[PDB]
Amino acid sequence: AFETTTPPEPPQFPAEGKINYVARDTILEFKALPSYSEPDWITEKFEKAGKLPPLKERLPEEPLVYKTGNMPDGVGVYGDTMRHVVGGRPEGWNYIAGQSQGWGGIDIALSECLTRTAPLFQVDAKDTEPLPNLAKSWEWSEDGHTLTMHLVKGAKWSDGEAFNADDVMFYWEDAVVDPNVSPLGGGASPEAFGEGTTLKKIDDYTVEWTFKAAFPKQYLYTMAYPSFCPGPSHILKPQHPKYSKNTYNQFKNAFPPEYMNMPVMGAWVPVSYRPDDLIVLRRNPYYWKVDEKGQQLPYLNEVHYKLSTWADRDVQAVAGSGDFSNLEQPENFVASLKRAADPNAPARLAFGPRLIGYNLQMNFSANGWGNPDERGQAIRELNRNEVFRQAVTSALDRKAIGDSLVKGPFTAIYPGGISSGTSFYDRASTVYYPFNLEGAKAALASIGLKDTDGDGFLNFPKETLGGRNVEITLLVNNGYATDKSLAEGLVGQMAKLGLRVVIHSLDSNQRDAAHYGGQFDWLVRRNSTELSSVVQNTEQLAPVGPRTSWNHRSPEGKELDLMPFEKEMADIVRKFISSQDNAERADLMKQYQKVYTQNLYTIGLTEYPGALIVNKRFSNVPQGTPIFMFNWAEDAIIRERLWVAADKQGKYELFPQQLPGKPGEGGPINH
Numbered sequence: 001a002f003e004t005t006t007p008p009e010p011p012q013f014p015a016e017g018k019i020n021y022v023a024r025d026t027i028l029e030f031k032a033l034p035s036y037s038e039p040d041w042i043t044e045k046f047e048k049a050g051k052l053p054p055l056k057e058r059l060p061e062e063p064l065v066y067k068t069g070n071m072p073d074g075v076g077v078y079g080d081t082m083r084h085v086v087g088g089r090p091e092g093w094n095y096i097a098g099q100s101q102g103w104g105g106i107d108i109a110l111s112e113c114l115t116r117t118a119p120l121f122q123v124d125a126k127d128t129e130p131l132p133n134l135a136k137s138w139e140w141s142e143d144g145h146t147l148t149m150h151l152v153k154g155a156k157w158s159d160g161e162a163f164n165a166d167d168v169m170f171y172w173e174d175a176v177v178d179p180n181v182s183p184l185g186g187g188a189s190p191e192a193f194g195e196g197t198t199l200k201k202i203d204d205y206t207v208e209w210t211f212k213a214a215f216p217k218q219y220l221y222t223m224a225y226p227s228f229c230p231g232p233s234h235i236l237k238p239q240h241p242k243y244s245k246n247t248y249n250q251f252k253n254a255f256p257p258e259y260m261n262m263p264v265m266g267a268w269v270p271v272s273y274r275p276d277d278l279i280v281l282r283r284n285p286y287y288w289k290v291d292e293k294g295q296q297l298p299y300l301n302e303v304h305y306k307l308s309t310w311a312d313r314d315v316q317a318v319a320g321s322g323d324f325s326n327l328e329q330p331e332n333f334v335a336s337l338k339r340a341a342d343p344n345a346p347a348r349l350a351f352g353p354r355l356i357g358y359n360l361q362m363n364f365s366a367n368g369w370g371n372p373d374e375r376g377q378a379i380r381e382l383n384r385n386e387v388f389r390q391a392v393t394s395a396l397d398r399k400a401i402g403d404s405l406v407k408g409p410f411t412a413i414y415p416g417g418i419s420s421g422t423s424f425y426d427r428a429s430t431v432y433y434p435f436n437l438e439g440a441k442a443a444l445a446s447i448g449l450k451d452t453d454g455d456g457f458l459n460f461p462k463e464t465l466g467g468r469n470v471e472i473t474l475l476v477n478n479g480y481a482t483d484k485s486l487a488e489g490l491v492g493q494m495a496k497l498g499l500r501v502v503i504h505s506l507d508s509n510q511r512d513a514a515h516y517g518g519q520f521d522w523l524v525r526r527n528s529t530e531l532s533s534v535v536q537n538t539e540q541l542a543p544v545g546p547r548t549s550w551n552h553r554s555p556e557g558k559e560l561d562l563m564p565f566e567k568e569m570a571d572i573v574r575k576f577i578s579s580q581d582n583a584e585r586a587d588l589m590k591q592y593q594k595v596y597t598q599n600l601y602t603i604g605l606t607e608y609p610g611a612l613i614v615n616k617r618f619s620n621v622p623q624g625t626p627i628f629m630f631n632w633a634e635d636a637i638i639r640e641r642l643w644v645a646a647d648k649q650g651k652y653e654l655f656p657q658q659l660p661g662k663p664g665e666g667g668p669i670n671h
Ligand SMILES: OC[C@H]1O[C@H](O)[C@H](O)[C@@H](O)[C@H]1O
Pocket: 103, 104, 105, 106, 108, 310, 326, 328, 632, 634
């Protein structure tokens, strides 16, 4: 049919950054400390003035204590600002209803979860337990069906109202289970946590999970970001349609970006917003996290998120106006490395493994996901045909694809599936469909695709759509140059084949509704955590549930119209989730990858490494922190643990010695 081989070994990528590997519990623990500390102005300008309760009351009985042994530069000092530059825009503050805050670490810094996984890049193997975040501990029953979860006892929201099970329950019942509410990210569906999995309150600081499978420990990662982020239930519940006279759109848009001081479990709170300009966050006085010395975290008092572009984030970091960047667009690498070459540069650049991938995803729903018309339906039928996918992938010159982004040692031939940069990857297991355009052309002719009008474009058979020319719609993320470069390239190569492809370029917010809704034929997408880690959001590897897959979901309400490879892939993923055996887990992924790549669950375009860019003044930045693994580096670096020595501190605070106001008020509080 096609002469399949294994993908070629990429060029050697030296002068990277080595991770200092550590055991799971070297990072944090939950203990009551003898005495506690904070910035002197809080005690002298707020506590003594009345304005705030003493620190001891603001903190839980047992706070989250960061161990100093795991701190790269040791225990810190208070002061300075973290200046971010984002390419996104806020929709509002309702994360659990599916509103974007702008990305670039803004929703990571606000919405804290039951567990935490991003810092697990530094723990040895891939059978690691996620770190206890809002849930301090958990026990499994002798059978493996029940998880008793113990929450942090005594934590408060950034406004002062207690954090308890009512917030965890509100999210599970009124967002996850509730079919009308859709949490931000497109993957917090009920089955993400297992089919027929329930959750129930015991007491205010104890919740109980009930799983259909025995010890499906892989779900503790789904309890981390983005899928299990509780919101301020005392603010959200009176706006919720089950609890009020609000529609689901009224609830969704109940808190516009202008609405200030929204209650968070995160280290900073939004105090200022200026459309297309800036969002300013100030340290949360009710933060439940401290260091071994009793100092109430964070160290940095202020966070900025400049509303600009994704490319400008890179430009501004190497120049020194922005403090942080994930350099992920190969079109920026050369400019960034040139500025990095200067020894007097304000930022340090550090490349990691090839964990950034892009895949072509085809809509596999033939039972009407996204309500397709006759032309739409005809493409879903082509997409599900294995000979059409084999020809589409073989018409791709993958060497030229990589070279269209950046020439050199960065890119790797990527057929699809598991990222080559991850441990779970097996090269022998990956199926490579080499560049064979003439072969691809002949395969499309064999399924009934020939040019009928002599224009150079292929045609549907006489029986399909009146024998009209083939028309495919490609959904593209408008916020990235890479996505666009790839989208245009694919169109040019699909044109050489004969397939006519139309670019539908939408803004991030729009693109997600058109994708998660099913309103697409083909799409270009950057790979999420499951292809970069396997262990994080494993449910997205196959259609295990009716909404767990990026390219094969079913309409509400209907069962999946799965293909035999997808059915076998879902069996692999379900077995992997409930497996505690590492050798079984390693060969389950060798199996998974082979089924993926040979069947073409997605069609790989290219893969490459991103670099972490941080301003040199920042301390406690872990060595070898990837830009993307269990999550984005914003999460991985532990920003509440970052600090700056007082002789290095910048003068960038826009509300110095101020704290957040009340939810709904103007902004921050002084004087
Ligand atoms: O959420 C963090 C994440 O947001 C966007 O997707 C950016 O492109 C990423 O590099 C990273 O900043």
